Amino acid sequence: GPLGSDYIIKEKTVLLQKKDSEGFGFVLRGAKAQTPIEEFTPTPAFPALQYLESVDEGGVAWRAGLRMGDFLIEVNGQNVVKVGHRQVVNMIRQGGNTLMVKVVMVTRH
Numbered sequence: 001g002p003l004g005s006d007y008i009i010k011e012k013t014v015l016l017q018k019k020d021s022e023g024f025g026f027v028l029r030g031a032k033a034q035t036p037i038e039e040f041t042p043t044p045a046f047p048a049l050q051y052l053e054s055v056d057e058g059g060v061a062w063r064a065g066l067r068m069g070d071f072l073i074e075v076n077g078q079n080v081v082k083v084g085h086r087q088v089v090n091m092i093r094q095g096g097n098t099l100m101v102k103v104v105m106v107t108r109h
Ligand SMILES: CC(C)C[C@H](N)C(=O)O
Pocket: 022, 023, 024, 025, 026, 027, 028, 088, 089, 092, 093
């Protein structure tokens, strides 16, 4: 609006269960480095450090509703908003064939 940006925030929590011989069907990417010098502070435009750079059409994540550009908020009950990339990758791998994840999709109206 006249006083600042307006956004639509859609929160999606999904349970992904994959087979051994497949991936969850997405590529995770960090939007910024995580340094211990200063905490990442979330904003509506930039709600988390990790996001879905791409999602395989027809894959597990896709069928559950995850989409390219979704920001990762939680992995298996743990907040990942401020967490660096390798650590988040480890947390996801810790679950094996099961991944519970909350994401947010942000659009500017
Ligand atoms: C977070 C990543 C380790 C997920 C992996 N690329 C997969 O599709 O299974």
